[PDB]
C-alpha cells in the first residue's frame, strides 16, 4: 500500500535518522571535524527521541506491508536510540585519542541505529532481514575501527565472517518459510494450516535456520562462541553498542515474530527454544566464572542474560505478561550494560594507539576513581539480580513468567545461573575496592561520567521503586 502523511508522521524516527546520516555525511565531505559531526549525530538522535514523542501522539498502524508502528515499536526504538546516544558520548573521548579519521564512527553508529529502528518496527521478513543487516555491517566497521590494533582487526574478521554465515542461514530459512507459506508477513507464517497440522516440516526447518541466524545475533548457545572475542577485541564504545542496542533490537523483532506468527506456538519450536534457554543460562554463567578480563566476563554475562530473556519469550503464548517482562528486563539490562561498559569505556579513553595495551585493571579502582567504582559496583549488583536494583526487577519478572507457565526446568536454571553470577559479579565488585600496587579534563569525558552516573541512579531508584517503569512498559502495548 501507499504511504500517507499519517504513515509519514509514524515514520519520523527512521526519517530523522536517515536525514541525520545524509547531513553528517555532507558535513564530513565539507570538512573533517570531530566535534561538529559528533554534535550533529547526537542532535539527530535526540530529535529522533522527540520524534518518538510525536509518533506516540499519533496512532498505531501498519506503515507498509513491511512496517508496523505501535507502542512496542516506540519502546524498543527509544531503547535503541538511548544506547546509540550513550555510544556516541562514550565514543568521543576514545576517538579524541584516535589518530585517523574519527567521524565515520558516527556515520556507522547512525546507520546501525537506523537498523535498530527498522527492527523495532519490522512486521515483515523483508524488514527483519534488512534490519539485521543494517545492524551488522556498520558494526563490522565499528568493531574493526582500530584495525591497526591486532585485537580489533581479529574481532572484526571473526564478527564479519560469522555474521555473513548467520545471515546466509537466516536468509535460507526465510526462503524455506516463504516456500511453505506464500506470504512473507509475520502474521501469515502458518495461516494456511489447520486441524493440528501446524508442524509442517518445511516451515519448521525454515524457522530452525532462522533460529540459527537469530541465535548467532543474540549470543545464544550454541551460537555464542564469538561473543567474548568480539566483546574484548572491539573498541569499548563499540562493545557498549554491541552489548546493548544490537541485542535489544534483535530480541524485540524476535518477540514480534513469535507473537504474530501462528507457528510461534508450535510445541517443537517451544522445546527447542527451551533447550537453548537452559543451555544459554547455564553455559554463560559457568563460562564467566574464571575470567580476569572484564569484557569477556560481560560477554558471557550477555549470553546468560539473553538466556533469561529467551525464558521470558518461551511463555509468550501461554501467559500474558511475557511482553511486559521482556520490556522491563530490557530496560534494566540496557541501563546496567550502559553503566558497566561505560566505566570500561571511560577508563580506556582516550585511545592509547594500536601498540599500547588497553587493559582495564579494575583492581583498586576506588582509590583513584571512586564515583566510577560506585557506578561499576551498582552495575555488578544489578546484573547479579540483587534487590534494590532494576536487574532484580527484571529477574523477578522472568521468574514470575516462568512460574505462571510451569517452566520448572527454566526456573531452576535461572536460580542456579543466578548463584554462579553472584560469584563472579561479586568477585569483580569487591576487587574494585582492594589495593593495587600501580596502574579527561574536558566536558565530553564528564558527559560520559554523567551518563554512567545517571544509569546508576536509574538502576537504584527503579530497583527500589519500579512502578514508573512497569507503568511505562505496560502502556507500550503492541497490536493484539
Amino acid at each position: 500500500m501507499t504511504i500517507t502523511p499519517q504513515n509519514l508522521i509514524a515514520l519520523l524516527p527512521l526519517l530523522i535518522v536517515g536525514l541525520t546520516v545524509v547531513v553528517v555525511m555532507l558535513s564530513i565531505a565539507w570538512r573533517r571535524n570531530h566535534f561538529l559531526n559528533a554534535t550533529l549525530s547526537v542532535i539527530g538522535l535526540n530529535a529522533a527521541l522527540v520524534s518518538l514523542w510525536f509518533v506516540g501522539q499519533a496512532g498505531a498502524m501498519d506503515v507498509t506491508p513491511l512496517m508496523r508502528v505501535d507502542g512496542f515499536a516506540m519502546l524498543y526504538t527509544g531503547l535503541v536510540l538511548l544506547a546509540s546516544l550513550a555510544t556516541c558520548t562514550f565514543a568521543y573521548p576514545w576517538l579524541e585519542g584516535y589518530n585517523d579519521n574519527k567521524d565515520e564512527f558516527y556515520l556507522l553508529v547512525l546507520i546501525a541505529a537506523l537498523g535498530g529502528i527498522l527492527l523495532a518496527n519490522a512486521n515483515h521478513l523483508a524488514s527483519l532481514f534488512l534490519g539485521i543487516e543494517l545492524i551488522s555491517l556498520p558494526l563490522f566497521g565499528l568493531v574493526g575501527y582500530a584495525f591497526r590494533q591486532k585485537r580489533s582487526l581479529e574481532a572484526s574478521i571473526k564478527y564479519t565472517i560469522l555474521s555473513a554465515a548467520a545471515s546466509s542461514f537466516l536468509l535460507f530459512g526465510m526462503a524455506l518459510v516463504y516456500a511453505q507459506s506464500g506470504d512473507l508477513s509475520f502474521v501469515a507464517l502458518g495461516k494456511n494450516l489447520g486441524d493440528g497440522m501446524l508442524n509442517e516440516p518445511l516451515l519448521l526447518a525454515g524457522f530452525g535456520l532462522m533460529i540459527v541466524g537469530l541465535g548467532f545475533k543474540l549470543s545464544l548457545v550454541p551460537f555464542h562462541l564469538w561473543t567474548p572475542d568480539v566483546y574484548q577485541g572491539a573498541p569499548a564504545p563499540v562493545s557498549t553498542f554491541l552489548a546493548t542496542a544490537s541485542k535489544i533490537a534483535i530480541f524485540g523483532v524476535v518477540m514480534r515474530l513469535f507473537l504474530y506468527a501462528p507457528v510461534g506456538d508450535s510445541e517443537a519450536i517451544r522445546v527447542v527454544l527451551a533447550i537453548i534457554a537452559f543451555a544459554s543460562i547455564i553455559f554463560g554463567n559457568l563460562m564467566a566464572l574464571s575470567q580476569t578480563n572484564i569484557k569477556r566476563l560481560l560477554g558471557y554475562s550477555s549470553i546468560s542474560h539473553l538466556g533469561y530473556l529467551l525464558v521470558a519469550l518461551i511463555a509468550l503464548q501461554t501467559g500474558e505478561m511475557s511482553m511486559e517482562a521482556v520490556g522491563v528486563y530490557l530496560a534494566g539490562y540496557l541501563f546496567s550494560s550502559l553503566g558497566a561498559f561505560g566505566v570500561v569505556s571511560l577508563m580506556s579513553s582516550p585511545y592509547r594507539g594500536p601498540d599500547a595495551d588497553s587493559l582495564f585493571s579494575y583492581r583498586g579502582l576506588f582509590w583513584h576513581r571512586p564515583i566510577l567504582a560506585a557506578v561499576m559496583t551498582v552495575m555488578m549488583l544489578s546484573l547479579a539480580g540483587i534487590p534494590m536494583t532494576l536487574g532484580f526487577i527484571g529477574k523477578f519478572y522472568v521468574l514470575a513468567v516462568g512460574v505462571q507457565a510451569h517452566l520448572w526446568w527454566l526456573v531452576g536454571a535461572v536460580v542456579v545461573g543466578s548463584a554462579i553470577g553472584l560469584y563472579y559479579y561479586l568477585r569483580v565488585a569487591v576487587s574494585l575496592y582492594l589495593h593495587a600496587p600501580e596502574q579527561p579534563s574536558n566536558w565530553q569525558y564528564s558527559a560520559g561520567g554523567i551518563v554512567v552516573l545517571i544509569s546508576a541512579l536509574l538502576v537504584l531508584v527503579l530497583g527500589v521503586w519500579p512502578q514508573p517503569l512497569i507503568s511505562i512498559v505496560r502502556l507500550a502495548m503492541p497490536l493484539m
Binding site: 534487590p387 536460580v415 553472584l422 512502578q467
Partner: protein
Amino acid sequence: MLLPWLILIPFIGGFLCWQTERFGVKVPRWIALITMGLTLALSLQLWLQGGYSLTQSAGIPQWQSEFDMPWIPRFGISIHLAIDGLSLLMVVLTGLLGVLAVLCSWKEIEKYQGFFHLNLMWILGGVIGVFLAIDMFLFFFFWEMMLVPMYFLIALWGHKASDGKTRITAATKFFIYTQASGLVMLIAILALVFVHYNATGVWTFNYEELLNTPMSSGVEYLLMLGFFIAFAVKMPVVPLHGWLPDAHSQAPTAGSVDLAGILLKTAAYGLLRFSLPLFPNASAEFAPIAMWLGVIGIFYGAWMAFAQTDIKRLIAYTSVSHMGFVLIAIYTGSQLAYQGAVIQMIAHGLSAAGLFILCGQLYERIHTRDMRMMGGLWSKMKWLPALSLFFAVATLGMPGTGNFVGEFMILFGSFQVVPVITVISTFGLVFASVYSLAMLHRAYFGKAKSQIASQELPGMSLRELFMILLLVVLLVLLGFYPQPILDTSHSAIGNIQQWFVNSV
C-alpha cells in the same frame, strides 16, 4: 505509624554516618550511637504503649500495630508492616544488639569509618524490616537487603590478620548460600501468589490474604520446602550451616558485625510467622524430618564446637546446636515449646553476643585466636576470664540464665509432643556442657602455652566492661524473671499455635 520510622531511622542514620564523616573521624560512631539509641527507645515505647501482657489470642491476623502504603500496585505489592508481641520482642532485641554493636566498634577510628557505620545501620534496618514486613515481597526484599552490607563488611572490614582472599571467600560463600536460598523462597512466594490468583482472580502479596489458600498436598509441600530451605540456610540447619563459622571467623574483629548481622535469628521467626500458618498441613507432615534435622544439628554443632581450635568457630557451632533446639521446638504443636523457643532466641542472642564481644576483646589483648597458644589467662587478665566463665556457664544451659528457661520449656513441650527426640536433645545438653568446659579449660585455665599468654594483659575499659555487665544483668534477669517476655509473646504464640493445630 511508627513502624516505617522503625525501619527508616537506621537508614537515615547510616546516611548521616556516611555524610558527617567530613566534620570528623570520631563523629560517625556518635551518629550511629544516637540513631540506634532512638531505634531502641522507639521499640521500648512500642512495648510500653502496646499492652502486650493484657491482650488475648484472637487468631491470625491480629496485629498490635499496622501500616500500609502501596508500592507496586501492578502486582498488589505494598509496604505493609505490622507488629505483634513476637515481632516486638525481636525488634527490641535487634535494637539492643545494634546499640551494643555501635559500642563495640568504638575506639576504632580510621578513614571510611562512616561507611562501616552505614553498612552496620543498613544491616540493622534490614533485620527490623524482616521482623516487621507482613507482605511477602517486602519480606523477601528485606531478607536479601541485609546481605550486601553484610558481604562488604566481611570482605572489606573483616579479620585484618587474614590473607585478604579468605575474607572474600567467606563473604562469597555466605552471600551465595543466603541469596540462593532466598531465590528459592521467591519461587515459593511467586507460586503461592499464582495459586491464589488462580483461586480468586486478584493479585496480592499480603500474608493475611494468602492464608487459607486452597491447594493440594503436593503443591503445599513444595511451597513449604522452598520456604524451609530459605529459613534453613539462615537458621542455620545442617547441612546448610557451612557459611556460618567461616563468616564468623572472617568477620570484623570487634565482633559488632556478628551481633548486627550474623547472630540474630530472622529464620526462626520466619518459620513461626510464614511456614506454620501459610502451610500448616505441609509443616505437619514435614515435622519428623525437621525435628530429626534439629537433633542432628544439636549433636553435630556440639561435636564441631568441641573440635575447634578457634574460639570464634567454637561459638558459631554453639549457635548451630542451640538453633537445632529451636528447630525442634518450632515443629511441635505446643504453646509451651513455642514460648521456650522465643525465650531461647532472646537468651541465645544475649549469650552469644557476650561470647563474641569477649572473644573480640581477648583477640585485641593477645593478638591470636588459637586456643593452643594460650592458657592460664585467669592469672593475667583482670575482668575478662570471669565474664567469659559466666557466658560459658550461660551457653552451657545453667539455671539462673535465660538459656536454661528457653531450653527447658522447649524440652517440656517437646516431651509432651515427642518424647524420644526430647530425650536425645537433653543428651545434647550434656554435649553442650562438654564443649563449654573444654573451651574454658583450653583458654583461661592451666599453664601458659606461649610467650604472649605469660604476660600481664591490660584490663577492660569502662565502656566494654559496662556493656558486658549489662548483658550479664539481662541474662540473669531473664533466667530468674522471664514472665514479662512470656506475657509479651503469649498472644502471638497462641495465634500461631492455634492456627497450626486447628487446620490439621
